[PDB]
């Protein structure tokens, strides 16, 4: 009867995911210019929620190094876009509702949870864009953080 009052923090087994992706380094801003190029390369045939895998992220400078990923069965057309399987992870999952650029309380809750359950966090982490109002408009955005743990 209760759903996403809190961050619904749990440990999940996430199986490998075939993605079309672009590796991006620069302002978290300039990533949104790319994520559409991924969709177009695979004729917009996603078979899962798009996500960003963060290898490096500084929220003080809001710049980082990341994979912009769209789960797909398709072969990408138009170079820059490649396909790989994102690896199996055992991850702390947190579900965030609303504006998603920083989500400091979510990452603090994940860190506190990890210490409580004696889990060791292992980058890289993912932000999964489950839902949102779409392209005709944010208090409705659903973003799942997946932070891998050491097994
Ligand atoms: Na908090
Ligand atoms: Na969100």
């Amino acid at each position: 009867h209760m759903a996403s009052m809190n961050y619904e923090i749990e440990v999940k087994d996430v199986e490998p995911i075939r993605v079309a992706f672009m590796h991006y380094k620069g302002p978290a801003a300039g990533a949104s210019k790319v994520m559409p190029n991924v969709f177009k390369s695979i004729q917009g045939k996603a078979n899962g929620a798009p996500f960003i895998c963060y290898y490096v992220m500084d929220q003080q400078t809001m710049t980082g190094e990341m994979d912009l990923c769209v789960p797909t069965a398709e072969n990408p057309v138009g170079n820059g876009i490649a396909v790989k399987d994102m690896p199996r992870i055992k991850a702390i999952s947190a579900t965030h509702i609303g504006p998603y650029e920083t989500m400091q309380p979510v990452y603090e809750a994940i860190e506190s949870y990890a210490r409580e359950k004696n889990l060791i966090l292992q980058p890289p982490f993912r932000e999964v864009f489950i839902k949102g109002p779409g392209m005709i408009l944010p208090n409705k955005y659903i973003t799942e953080v997946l932070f891998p743990i050491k097994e």
Side-chain angles (χ1 to χ4, degrees), residues 7 104-106 108-109:
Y7 294 130
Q104 279 194 300
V106 184
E108 189 64 31

Side-chain angles (χ1 to χ4, degrees), residues 73-137:
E74 298 305 309
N75 292 323
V77 183
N79 36 49
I81 314 312
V83 167
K84 62 182 176 176
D85 286 17
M86 295 308 293
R88 176 170 292 283
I89 55 172
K90 195 179 214 75
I92 298 165
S93 166
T95 301
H96 176 273
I97 314 293
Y100 59 55
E101 61 153 39
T102 53
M103 307 193 286
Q104 279 194 300
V106 184
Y107 285 98
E108 189 64 31
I110 287 166
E111 194 85 19
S112 177
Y113 185 88
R115 280 203 309 278
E116 185 188 333
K117 303 294 178 182
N118 305 301
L119 307 177
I120 298 154
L121 293 177
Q122 210 158 244
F125 63 89
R126 304 176 197 179
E127 290 177 359
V128 190
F129 308 110
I130 300 298
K131 212 179 283 276
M135 55 174 65
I136 313 312
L137 308 184

Side-chain angles (χ1 to χ4, degrees), residues 37-58:
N37 284 22
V38 183
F39 270 97
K40 161 128 200 184
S41 72
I42 55 140
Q43 332 297 299
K45 292 168 180 152
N47 64 4
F51 60 95
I52 299 175
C53 187
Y54 293 92
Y55 302 101
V56 182
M57 192 60 226
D58 184 340

